[PDB]
Amino acid sequence: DFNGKITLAITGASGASYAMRLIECLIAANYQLYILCSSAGRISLDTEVGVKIPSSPDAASKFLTEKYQAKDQQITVFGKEQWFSPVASGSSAPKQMVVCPCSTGTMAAICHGMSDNLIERAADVVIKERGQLILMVRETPFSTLHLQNMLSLSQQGVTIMPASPGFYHKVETIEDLIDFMVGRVLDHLGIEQDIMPRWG
Amino acid sequence: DFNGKITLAITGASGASYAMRLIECLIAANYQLYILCSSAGRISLDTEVGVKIPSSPDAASKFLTEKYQAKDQQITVFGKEQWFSPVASGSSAPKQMVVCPCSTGTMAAICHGMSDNLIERAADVVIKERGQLILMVRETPFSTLHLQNMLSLSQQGVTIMPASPGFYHKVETIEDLIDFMVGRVLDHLGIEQDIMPRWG
Amino acid sequence: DFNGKITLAITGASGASYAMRLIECLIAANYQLYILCSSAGRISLDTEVGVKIPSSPDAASKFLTEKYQAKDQQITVFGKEQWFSPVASGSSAPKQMVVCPCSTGTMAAICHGMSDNLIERAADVVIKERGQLILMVRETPFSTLHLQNMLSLSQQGVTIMPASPGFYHKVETIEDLIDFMVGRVLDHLGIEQDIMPRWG
Amino acid sequence: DFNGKITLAITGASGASYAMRLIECLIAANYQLYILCSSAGRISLDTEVGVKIPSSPDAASKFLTEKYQAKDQQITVFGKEQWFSPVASGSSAPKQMVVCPCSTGTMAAICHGMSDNLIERAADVVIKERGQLILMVRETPFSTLHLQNMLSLSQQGVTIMPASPGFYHKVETIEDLIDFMVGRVLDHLGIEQDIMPRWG
Amino acid sequence: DFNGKITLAITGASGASYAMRLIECLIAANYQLYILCSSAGRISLDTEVGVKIPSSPDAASKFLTEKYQAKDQQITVFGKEQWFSPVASGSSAPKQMVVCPCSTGTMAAICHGMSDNLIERAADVVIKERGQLILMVRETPFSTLHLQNMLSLSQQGVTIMPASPGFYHKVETIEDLIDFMVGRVLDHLGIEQDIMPRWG
Amino acid sequence: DFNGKITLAITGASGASYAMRLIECLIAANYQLYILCSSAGRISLDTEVGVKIPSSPDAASKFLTEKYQAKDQQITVFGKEQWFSPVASGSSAPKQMVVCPCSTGTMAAICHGMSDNLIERAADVVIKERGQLILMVRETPFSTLHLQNMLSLSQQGVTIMPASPGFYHKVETIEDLIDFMVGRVLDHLGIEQDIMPRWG
Amino acid sequence: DFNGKITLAITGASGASYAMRLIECLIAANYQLYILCSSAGRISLDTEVGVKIPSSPDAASKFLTEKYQAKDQQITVFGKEQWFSPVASGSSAPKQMVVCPCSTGTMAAICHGMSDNLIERAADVVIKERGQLILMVRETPFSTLHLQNMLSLSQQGVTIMPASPGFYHKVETIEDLIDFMVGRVLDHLGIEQDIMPRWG
Amino acid sequence: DFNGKITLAITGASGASYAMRLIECLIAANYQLYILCSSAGRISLDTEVGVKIPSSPDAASKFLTEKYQAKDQQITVFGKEQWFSPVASGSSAPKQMVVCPCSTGTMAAICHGMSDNLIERAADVVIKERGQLILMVRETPFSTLHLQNMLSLSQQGVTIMPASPGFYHKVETIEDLIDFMVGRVLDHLGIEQDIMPRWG
Amino acid sequence: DFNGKITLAITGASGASYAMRLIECLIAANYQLYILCSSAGRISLDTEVGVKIPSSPDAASKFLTEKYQAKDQQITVFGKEQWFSPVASGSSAPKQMVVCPCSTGTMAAICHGMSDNLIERAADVVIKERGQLILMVRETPFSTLHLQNMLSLSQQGVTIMPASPGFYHKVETIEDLIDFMVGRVLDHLGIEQDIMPRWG
Amino acid sequence: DFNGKITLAITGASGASYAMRLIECLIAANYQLYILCSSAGRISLDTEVGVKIPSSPDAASKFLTEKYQAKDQQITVFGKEQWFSPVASGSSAPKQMVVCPCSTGTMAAICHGMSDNLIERAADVVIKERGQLILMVRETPFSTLHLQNMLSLSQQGVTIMPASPGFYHKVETIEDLIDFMVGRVLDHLGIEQDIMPRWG
């Protein structure tokens, strides 16, 4: 008895911390998560935050389940070519999906409809079902070609959310900046920011 | 005998720290600066970082000169409607200009050619002279209309550089993230990153 | 314990009566209102309907509160440059906003992302959050440039609702025509037309 | 010896009163009128204002002639498929045509060149002769597709005049609002507003 | 008993002399003028040609009336926010308007429909009434964004007339070059060049 | 040992004086010039400024060499169909070319890639090599079709520089206006304005 | 044993003679014809050339069969709403269709995919099967909207063939002008012009 | 004392008879004509109708003057490169110009702004002055590229009038078909069809 | 009794050898050729391969006939302004045309519909008849404007075939590279590569 | 102490010889090279020119170093998924990159921002840093879709340089044709052609 199901995709764009905080807040918000991680996403998590997700999808699910202390079936990891997954079909796919962080190469593939891996096929499905797809892009600067990619998607209802946190405080901390972006994701997903737990 | 002249514009987009670090690095790089600050830019600097720029352009120049310990004529502040300034003419305007941070409302005015204040007129001049204009946008998400604004400018040679720093370290610090963006500005300006001084 | 929060903006386009009836119906529907009025909006209200809104935002809130007999905190007026207001941030801004009536100059500024006053910044925020923005345009004829403005916004999900009431009765009255437009606003906002009170 | 010839088309868009006042003012201005009324236009006139135009074009001409007390040949009604009419040819068609009110379905047909009835063929002719076609649209809101229709026509020189009267008075009356729109039609047609007669 | 009414707007684009000669020729042609001058327009007139227009609209009207020796009511100056002026309404606005000279920032505002001052609202009105608006642009070079602005307006029937006089003589004089542009304005307005008086 | 090589093209657009002053300043700046003159360019030079360029390219080179007192090989004129010239090849063509003045017919041919004479082929070459092409257009008004031509070229990196000099002085002289445009050309070419010699 | 099957549609555009000569030449070329005639097409044939096609499709087939002396099954007329006809299906429809003459209203319907009668559905079918559709337009002038219609179709492979015969002779005759257009149709259909029989 | 001045251009598109009838009707209507004929136009007139226009512009003027019995100065022929002609300047050029007939190659040059001969420069001038240019195109079929050419011009206010006469009679004659097109030209020029003289 | 008729055009783009090999293979394939050569095409043939085509079209036909040993009427050369040629009419023009090699200036003229010489008129004819036009472009790099030219033509069915031979062998020879391109032309023309004769 | 750093990418498009000559000339010009080779690039080098690059990046660097006799660190090969390479970051990536030869599939991926291998990520980086990317395309013909790809990139500043060498000599050799293209690459890179060594 979860409050919703969300697809979470993690790519390699140097914003692993955002992804990890997102998952924590979504677990606390009592949502069911289907988690997809690219090759580069996995390696980013290790390098940036020391989280070593097993490549085996079963052992990966168990791993995140214990990390975050999640409920039975609350977290399921699917593999990069596991095309039988619920996220690959209009029928069983969550109506909300976040790509956090999102590389411009993945964003481009999504823009053009390439569907060369599970992340890209899941996004394609959310778009054809007129669901809610949030791409938390992490790249700078933005070339002309990537703005044309972004513009396309945006016109088609996808939320382009660059990881560009504001500095709203007098002494800013890395936790404020991560939460700035994560609370705005939750805001877009319709989930209350009051459920976000303490960092300490 | 400075190495170059650059126009620096500061708007209110919650990224004051980036602007302050930029100025420091540009002073250290031995460039001449012409500094423009919007109303909201001034108030942002006070709130976010406790820098209280006098509104008087003369007293403002002196103020930043002492703050950063700059050379005679190294820093000159111009006022929001001082249309006689060197930045308002093709003849005397620096060929490089950075807007750091850049609100989307200022970016929109620049995109459409509005020139309603000195920041917008200076940008307009850099664009017609086919100079180098770098807009360090700080906003999220990016609406469709603002991506169309960004795309226009980008197609016209303006560098759209969202303030989206990468997390390249194992324990990230607010100084790494500021420098991530500032070193990339300097990279685009053709200035060596080796001149950036210590934070302590 | 209100049923919702809505932003109401009033510009000068000669349709003050529509705005005044809207507010009445929204108060009766038990919504919380954040009210923005441009310079020309204020002067329009005086000329067209003899409503003299104090320019002071506090005294303006009190004034409308007594006029319409609203609940504590049910009506708050914000000032044209009060950038700290809840409507200027994605986090705290109502997800529904109506501009009633809407000048084409304000509509143009919104279309292009100009954000030169609080009305324009509030609209910009509703659009980037993919909220519901209803512009009740009052202008005729519609130039080519203003149709391109309207078309842009419409494509981006904004409801362009010209103040073009139908004549559905045998003896039409000015109250029928105002309500024609106001009931259609309420229809779009998802509020029941049965709550609209008697004119007498 | 009339001052001009104008084509007047009436569709069903709930603005019959505007059409009836227009005809009165044009008769008083001493113009020759060729009147076209769609099926829905006829039924609108009955419902909204109790004017029962005979479907027979001859008896319809006589009827309006007596209603408005017009001069011999001052008013001629043509039928929905009478393709031999002067309005269906470049040679004999008035150079000014007003569609009052104008449904969006008729406007769409005109935009796309469909010419499926006499109204649409007459408009097509005014457009190819680079005459003056005024469409007094009565619809709200304006969908995206209908703004693209409007924009096309406007770019091609057609005057899109939504029936969106302004409230310029202290106690507005239904007669002021009708005249607001009708005087603006006359303004566009180059006819003096001083000839508009009293309502009483 | 004047031959016509024209709106004349003067902006700051360094072409004050053209404006002053235009007014002289239009007075001599016996037209009624409504004159609008921006802030920068006023300061340009002082600097470039020593004409010090009082900012008070009444004293400004009187001033130009005596300067040029014009007939009662032949010249009326309106103020930058006097929104009750005849030029701000479709009903009473001249069907011909010249902006001489025209800054690109004003041209941009007109292109996008901004209407932030009386000049921009007057232009907006001429465009929606399908009048004749002549923009005598004075700027070089023309950026890409400003050509897109110009192209829009031109497509919408506005005459883009850069102040680019030809050198048609063997010894050219500053008076020949001013008249080159002014006679071409008069040519577009349908006024005879034979009425232009002697410079001496 | 010249400081650079530039291609200079002269067309018939009534701005011969600008061309003649340009050449003088470029000779003084110690650049090597390759000069192209159209049929109408030659006749313009005679009529407007009494410079009678021999049509023979050899005698034309000698002629300008003596006129301006240039160094051996400093000035070479090529003929309208001499397709073996260095300006007709990517390999040997200067990377900077100015068309001064530039007719709209030549500009159109350049925009569309027509290459029907040497001027048009030289421009085509500068554009494909991504060199610097400056078109000093002299025409007014600018039709819609010519703005589309200009816009194309501008988007493709060509500097559209209408001959629209500003009036920056209190008593303007024809020499100030010529230099206004010529100093701005030199500004774009990266050549110091301090080298421009006295007129007397 | 015919050489091919062609669909022939006749609309009302005042070019009945062309249609009648086409049919004659196609019968002589030994093609099988499926003939469609609109309401206005039928009336045009009577008025312009005294050919009174019965509205009954069976009696119409017999009628044309005797007129032109055609072979059993060589000519079959289908009715305006007979949706079971072979021309309404991809499977059984001729791959070549000519609309001769073609009204702009029919052309518009075809351009937009309206399929409101058999002519329009047959054309729609030829286009989706990537067959050969030839529209012999007869209209002048061509409005902007109708050129956009024509351009669309042309881009999509439809042959826009205005009935604009050339005057290639010294004494031109109405028969030369009809044949000019008909021989060019046959040229496009791949049928030899040598089979066209004598007029006398 | 003529009623107007018109520019008439004749190209080679096989419609010489139309041109010759036009001139006759315009002479009878008492207009002043400036006549331009291309190389191919001249040869077309000889071949198609036995009119041998001398290539010398003076002897050509005299020739047409006697042919049509025109008044002193009523007909003046200008030569293909006589750039001093009144039709080559905004100041002295007729505001109405007809190209009859018009080749698609000339139309293309006009569309793109090429101005390679006097016909093309005259058209360019009418377009920049926002005059009335009527192109009586004679070509079939219309390729895609030529419809894009036509569409451009049409959007820019040029009347594309293919030589596609209707068959409005029971026995059509070559004179009816020529007049069909010529009366429609006169209709567009605002000249009464009653002045067209007898053929016999 | 030839197998087909093809139009071959040779321009100056430094690829004369390709043209000469093409002709040889087409003669061997037993096709009838109509050969067009521009001014620059002729000079290219002399310089690059020592083939001196007489400018006289009759002597040129005879010359190529003997060179290649062709059959009576197998090769006919037409002159650059011989407008009576079969290639200038829809009726008699080959349905296949190759421009080998093709300059970008000729390609541009074809793209825009200029038809200023016989090559350009022949191409225009193949395009309007929806024939097969193959442009073997020889230019590098490809500017933006020339890619827009190429893209247009390609979209309109023209085969853009840059002369970019592949290196498919271990020791490549100039004959392999010529044939690479020529066999691909023949492939597109539907002619068997087995008929290509030995080089020796 | 090299003169510059360049990224060289080799794909499979049958132009291996060009790549090998490029490397030689760049080594001789004393530039530092970072070399990327696709799977198909490697196999092309073996087949076409017998160069067997080891797939191991270290052994590949050593191999090319000895082949060309390069200086320590002068040549470094990176592997197809080695994402830590200097070419994958804005900070350390050469500002000049050549893809020689370039397949259309790689070009398409670059156009759309796909970044699926190191070549595509390196190009993406040069484009976002507004560096110099030269694509030496080798393909014929160019489909419509690939011209749209090329056009995009070109508009965004990428140099599309088809491998289309000119035949500038009397007896052409395969070495002349390779150098034609390689000298033009060096020309674009700003490197002197005088440093290119002898083939023998």
mmCIF file of C-alpha atoms in Angstrom, chain G:
data_model
loop_
_atom_site.group_PDB
_atom_site.id
_atom_site.type_symbol
_atom_site.label_atom_id
_atom_site.label_comp_id
_atom_site.label_asym_id
_atom_site.label_seq_id
_atom_site.Cartn_x
_atom_site.Cartn_y
_atom_site.Cartn_z
ATOM 1 C CA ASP G 1 -8.130 -5.163 -73.079
ATOM 2 C CA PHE G 2 -7.488 -1.460 -72.437
ATOM 3 C CA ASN G 3 -4.003 0.078 -72.045
ATOM 4 C CA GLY G 4 -4.668 1.528 -68.603
ATOM 5 C CA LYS G 5 -7.255 2.787 -66.171
ATOM 6 C CA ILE G 6 -7.435 6.515 -65.264
ATOM 7 C CA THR G 7 -9.697 8.426 -62.933
ATOM 8 C CA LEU G 8 -11.119 11.615 -64.443
ATOM 9 C CA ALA G 9 -12.791 14.175 -62.209
ATOM 10 C CA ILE G 10 -14.603 17.234 -63.580
ATOM 11 C CA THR G 11 -15.281 20.233 -61.324
ATOM 12 C CA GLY G 12 -16.846 23.666 -61.965
ATOM 13 C CA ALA G 13 -13.988 25.986 -62.779
ATOM 14 C CA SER G 14 -15.025 27.169 -66.258
ATOM 15 C CA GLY G 15 -12.819 24.773 -68.231
ATOM 16 C CA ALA G 16 -15.363 22.162 -69.423
ATOM 17 C CA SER G 17 -13.978 22.076 -72.936
ATOM 18 C CA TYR G 18 -10.636 20.908 -71.675
ATOM 19 C CA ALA G 19 -12.363 17.938 -69.894
ATOM 20 C CA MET G 20 -14.326 16.955 -72.989
ATOM 21 C CA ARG G 21 -11.259 16.972 -75.202
ATOM 22 C CA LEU G 22 -9.279 15.004 -72.607
ATOM 23 C CA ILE G 23 -11.946 12.245 -72.513
ATOM 24 C CA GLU G 24 -11.944 12.063 -76.293
ATOM 25 C CA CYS G 25 -8.152 11.637 -76.447
ATOM 26 C CA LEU G 26 -8.092 9.124 -73.635
ATOM 27 C CA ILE G 27 -10.840 7.086 -75.310
ATOM 28 C CA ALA G 28 -8.822 7.189 -78.554
ATOM 29 C CA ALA G 29 -5.670 6.188 -76.622
ATOM 30 C CA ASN G 30 -7.671 3.127 -75.577
ATOM 31 C CA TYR G 31 -7.729 3.760 -71.819
ATOM 32 C CA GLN G 32 -10.378 2.740 -69.379
ATOM 33 C CA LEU G 33 -11.974 5.700 -67.664
ATOM 34 C CA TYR G 34 -13.673 6.141 -64.346
ATOM 35 C CA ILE G 35 -15.468 9.513 -64.490
ATOM 36 C CA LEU G 36 -16.509 11.645 -61.536
ATOM 37 C CA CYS G 37 -18.383 14.929 -61.937
ATOM 38 C CA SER G 38 -19.301 17.371 -59.180
ATOM 39 C CA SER G 39 -22.622 19.262 -59.058
ATOM 40 C CA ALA G 40 -21.013 22.389 -60.414
ATOM 41 C CA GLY G 41 -19.021 20.215 -62.913
ATOM 42 C CA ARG G 42 -22.351 18.964 -64.439
ATOM 43 C CA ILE G 43 -23.818 22.461 -64.698
ATOM 44 C CA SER G 44 -20.574 23.752 -66.203
ATOM 45 C CA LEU G 45 -20.687 21.143 -68.966
ATOM 46 C CA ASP G 46 -24.273 22.197 -69.867
ATOM 47 C CA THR G 47 -23.609 25.970 -69.865
ATOM 48 C CA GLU G 48 -20.189 25.976 -71.473
ATOM 49 C CA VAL G 49 -20.509 23.166 -74.023
ATOM 50 C CA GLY G 50 -24.093 21.908 -74.093
ATOM 51 C CA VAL G 51 -23.308 18.461 -72.736
ATOM 52 C CA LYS G 52 -26.107 17.405 -70.411
ATOM 53 C CA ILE G 53 -24.768 14.478 -68.322
ATOM 54 C CA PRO G 54 -27.682 12.606 -66.669
ATOM 55 C CA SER G 55 -27.267 12.667 -62.890
ATOM 56 C CA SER G 56 -28.080 8.925 -62.708
ATOM 57 C CA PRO G 57 -24.666 7.199 -62.809
ATOM 58 C CA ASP G 58 -25.870 4.295 -65.024
ATOM 59 C CA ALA G 59 -27.591 6.470 -67.590
ATOM 60 C CA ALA G 60 -24.559 8.772 -67.394
ATOM 61 C CA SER G 61 -22.180 5.964 -68.278
ATOM 62 C CA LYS G 62 -24.330 4.949 -71.230
ATOM 63 C CA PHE G 63 -24.582 8.541 -72.385
ATOM 64 C CA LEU G 64 -20.866 9.129 -72.495
ATOM 65 C CA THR G 65 -20.330 5.709 -73.975
ATOM 66 C CA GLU G 66 -22.504 6.649 -76.988
ATOM 67 C CA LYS G 67 -21.236 10.136 -77.231
ATOM 68 C CA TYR G 68 -17.635 9.020 -77.647
ATOM 69 C CA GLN G 69 -18.389 5.584 -79.130
ATOM 70 C CA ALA G 70 -16.451 3.812 -76.431
ATOM 71 C CA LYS G 71 -15.944 0.066 -75.877
ATOM 72 C CA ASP G 72 -17.974 -2.011 -73.369
ATOM 73 C CA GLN G 73 -16.821 -1.060 -69.834
ATOM 74 C CA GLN G 74 -14.523 1.628 -71.301
ATOM 75 C CA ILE G 75 -16.413 4.452 -69.445
ATOM 76 C CA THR G 76 -18.103 4.221 -66.022
ATOM 77 C CA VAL G 77 -19.498 7.202 -64.144
ATOM 78 C CA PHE G 78 -19.658 7.130 -60.390
ATOM 79 C CA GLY G 79 -21.899 9.264 -58.226
ATOM 80 C CA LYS G 80 -20.891 11.893 -55.745
ATOM 81 C CA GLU G 81 -21.542 9.765 -52.632
ATOM 82 C CA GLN G 82 -21.122 6.177 -54.065
ATOM 83 C CA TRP G 83 -18.452 5.153 -51.571
ATOM 84 C CA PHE G 84 -18.304 1.524 -52.754
ATOM 85 C CA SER G 85 -16.748 2.579 -56.055
ATOM 86 C CA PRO G 86 -13.327 1.239 -57.062
ATOM 87 C CA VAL G 87 -11.840 4.717 -56.915
ATOM 88 C CA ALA G 88 -12.477 4.914 -53.095
ATOM 89 C CA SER G 89 -10.063 2.084 -52.271
ATOM 90 C CA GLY G 90 -6.341 1.687 -52.456
ATOM 91 C CA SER G 91 -6.816 -1.823 -53.844
ATOM 92 C CA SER G 92 -8.908 -1.081 -56.939
ATOM 93 C CA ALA G 93 -8.235 2.579 -57.683
ATOM 94 C CA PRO G 94 -6.403 3.665 -60.775
ATOM 95 C CA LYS G 95 -2.912 4.815 -60.087
ATOM 96 C CA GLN G 96 -3.434 7.899 -62.335
ATOM 97 C CA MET G 97 -6.051 10.551 -61.703
ATOM 98 C CA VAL G 98 -6.707 13.883 -63.390
ATOM 99 C CA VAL G 99 -8.947 16.649 -62.034
ATOM 100 C CA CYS G 100 -9.856 18.661 -65.154
ATOM 101 C CA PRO G 101 -10.679 21.451 -64.584
ATOM 102 C CA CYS G 102 -10.015 21.856 -60.872
ATOM 103 C CA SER G 103 -11.674 24.546 -58.740
ATOM 104 C CA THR G 104 -9.559 25.954 -55.937
ATOM 105 C CA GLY G 105 -12.195 24.807 -53.413
ATOM 106 C CA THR G 106 -11.771 21.214 -54.472
ATOM 107 C CA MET G 107 -7.987 21.575 -54.580
ATOM 108 C CA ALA G 108 -8.174 23.011 -50.947
ATOM 109 C CA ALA G 109 -10.206 20.074 -49.715
ATOM 110 C CA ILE G 110 -7.733 17.699 -51.345
ATOM 111 C CA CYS G 111 -4.766 19.621 -49.812
ATOM 112 C CA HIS G 112 -6.223 19.367 -46.298
ATOM 113 C CA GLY G 113 -7.508 15.726 -46.603
ATOM 114 C CA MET G 114 -11.223 16.495 -46.284
ATOM 115 C CA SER G 115 -12.657 13.666 -48.416
ATOM 116 C CA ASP G 116 -16.287 15.164 -48.243
ATOM 117 C CA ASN G 117 -17.277 13.681 -51.625
ATOM 118 C CA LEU G 118 -16.110 11.034 -54.025
ATOM 119 C CA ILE G 119 -13.773 13.322 -55.951
ATOM 120 C CA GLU G 120 -11.968 14.284 -52.768
ATOM 121 C CA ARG G 121 -11.866 10.723 -51.430
ATOM 122 C CA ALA G 122 -10.479 9.421 -54.825
ATOM 123 C CA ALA G 123 -7.736 12.057 -54.772
ATOM 124 C CA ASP G 124 -6.949 11.173 -51.176
ATOM 125 C CA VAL G 125 -6.549 7.571 -52.173
ATOM 126 C CA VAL G 126 -4.209 8.324 -55.168
ATOM 127 C CA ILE G 127 -2.078 10.430 -52.783
ATOM 128 C CA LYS G 128 -1.782 7.755 -50.019
ATOM 129 C CA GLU G 129 -0.961 5.107 -52.679
ATOM 130 C CA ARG G 130 1.709 7.497 -54.121
ATOM 131 C CA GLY G 131 0.011 7.528 -57.453
ATOM 132 C CA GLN G 132 -0.054 10.276 -60.009
ATOM 133 C CA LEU G 133 -2.602 13.101 -59.311
ATOM 134 C CA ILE G 134 -2.759 15.983 -61.802
ATOM 135 C CA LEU G 135 -4.816 19.002 -60.865
ATOM 136 C CA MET G 136 -5.513 21.287 -63.838
ATOM 137 C CA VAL G 137 -6.319 24.388 -61.812
ATOM 138 C CA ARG G 138 -8.439 27.103 -63.459
ATOM 139 C CA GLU G 139 -8.501 30.246 -61.413
ATOM 140 C CA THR G 140 -6.937 33.664 -61.492
ATOM 141 C CA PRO G 141 -5.444 35.379 -59.665
ATOM 142 C CA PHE G 142 -4.000 32.923 -57.139
ATOM 143 C CA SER G 143 -4.430 34.171 -53.612
ATOM 144 C CA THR G 144 -1.704 33.596 -50.992
ATOM 145 C CA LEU G 145 -3.815 30.909 -49.262
ATOM 146 C CA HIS G 146 -4.326 29.057 -52.484
ATOM 147 C CA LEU G 147 -0.612 29.146 -53.332
ATOM 148 C CA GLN G 148 0.074 27.647 -49.839
ATOM 149 C CA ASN G 149 -2.512 24.905 -50.758
ATOM 150 C CA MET G 150 -0.834 24.342 -54.139
ATOM 151 C CA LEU G 151 2.655 24.371 -52.664
ATOM 152 C CA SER G 152 1.671 21.679 -50.079
ATOM 153 C CA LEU G 153 0.284 19.359 -52.692
ATOM 154 C CA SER G 154 3.152 19.960 -55.062
ATOM 155 C CA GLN G 155 5.666 19.107 -52.306
ATOM 156 C CA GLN G 156 3.735 15.907 -51.812
ATOM 157 C CA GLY G 157 4.076 14.945 -55.419
ATOM 158 C CA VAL G 158 0.864 16.239 -56.948
ATOM 159 C CA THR G 159 1.204 17.929 -60.355
ATOM 160 C CA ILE G 160 -0.236 21.451 -60.248
ATOM 161 C CA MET G 161 -1.022 22.238 -63.805
ATOM 162 C CA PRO G 162 -2.736 25.540 -64.224
ATOM 163 C CA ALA G 163 -4.829 25.869 -67.361
ATOM 164 C CA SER G 164 -2.514 28.485 -68.799
ATOM 165 C CA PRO G 165 -2.023 27.617 -72.375
ATOM 166 C CA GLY G 166 0.789 29.123 -74.427
ATOM 167 C CA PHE G 167 0.303 30.982 -77.733
ATOM 168 C CA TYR G 168 2.756 29.195 -79.929
ATOM 169 C CA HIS G 169 1.197 30.064 -83.297
ATOM 170 C CA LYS G 170 0.728 32.952 -85.620
ATOM 171 C CA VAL G 171 -3.092 32.727 -85.702
ATOM 172 C CA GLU G 172 -4.068 30.920 -82.471
ATOM 173 C CA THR G 173 -7.342 29.016 -82.319
ATOM 174 C CA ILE G 174 -9.402 27.851 -79.358
ATOM 175 C CA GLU G 175 -8.666 24.237 -80.446
ATOM 176 C CA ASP G 176 -4.805 24.893 -80.268
ATOM 177 C CA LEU G 177 -5.185 26.262 -76.677
ATOM 178 C CA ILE G 178 -7.330 23.305 -75.526
ATOM 179 C CA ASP G 179 -4.901 20.897 -77.057
ATOM 180 C CA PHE G 180 -1.948 22.710 -75.595
ATOM 181 C CA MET G 181 -3.271 21.790 -72.140
ATOM 182 C CA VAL G 182 -4.626 18.312 -73.088
ATOM 183 C CA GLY G 183 -1.380 17.247 -74.840
ATOM 184 C CA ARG G 184 0.504 18.263 -71.728
ATOM 185 C CA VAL G 185 -1.796 16.144 -69.590
ATOM 186 C CA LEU G 186 -1.173 13.197 -71.931
ATOM 187 C CA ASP G 187 2.545 13.936 -71.847
ATOM 188 C CA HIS G 188 2.416 13.649 -67.961
ATOM 189 C CA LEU G 189 0.288 10.449 -68.168
ATOM 190 C CA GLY G 190 2.837 8.861 -70.489
ATOM 191 C CA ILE G 191 0.426 8.666 -73.398
ATOM 192 C CA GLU G 192 1.449 9.477 -76.960
ATOM 193 C CA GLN G 193 0.211 12.746 -78.424
ATOM 194 C CA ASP G 194 0.012 11.037 -81.875
ATOM 195 C CA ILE G 195 -3.253 9.314 -80.873
ATOM 196 C CA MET G 196 -5.166 12.669 -80.449
ATOM 197 C CA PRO G 197 -7.834 12.801 -83.110
ATOM 198 C CA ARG G 198 -8.946 15.527 -85.455
ATOM 199 C CA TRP G 199 -11.343 18.182 -84.178
ATOM 200 C CA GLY G 200 -13.419 18.860 -87.390
#
